[PDB]
């Protein structure tokens, strides 16, 4: 599960 | 043509306005303009999600 990028 | 995408992994929203989904769920694309955050609908819900968590379905 890849990391969620900048919001 | 109405575009769809399927969930690769589960995605639990961290902020408001984000769409929650389980892997295997088929999401309907509303907006795909931003390369990172796409917007879609999953039954009742509507919101943005990480594009790297999905891939094409239909």
């Amino acid at each position: 599960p890849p990391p969620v990028g900048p919001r | 043509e109405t575009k769809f995408v399927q969930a690769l992994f589960d995605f639990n929203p961290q902020e408001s306005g984000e769409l929650a989904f389980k892997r295997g769920d088929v999401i309907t694309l509303i907006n795909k303009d931003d390369p990172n955050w796409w917007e879609g609908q999953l039954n009742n819900r509507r919101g943005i999600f990480p594009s790297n968590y999905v891939c094409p379905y239909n």
Side-chain angles (χ1 to χ4, degrees), chain A, chain B residues 1-57:
Chain A
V4 178
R7 291 171 163 70
Chain B
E1 184 198 319
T2 307
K3 298 303 181 176
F4 298 89
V5 293
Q6 52 180 316
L8 290 166
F9 326 87
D10 295 0
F11 169 66
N12 197 203
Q14 220 73 48
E15 294 178 7
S16 58
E18 288 171 2
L19 180 61
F21 58 63
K22 291 282 123 60
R23 88 163 185 285
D25 280 350
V26 179
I27 299 85
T28 304
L29 287 180
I30 297 176
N31 190 281
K32 187 182 172 179
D33 281 48
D34 186 68
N36 302 98
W37 292 91
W38 295 350
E39 182 180 29
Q41 179 103 217
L42 191 58
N43 192 359
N44 320 118
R45 287 75 175 173
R46 179 188 297 234
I48 59 175
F49 55 86
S51 62
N52 65 338
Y53 267 67
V54 306
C55 68
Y57 179 87

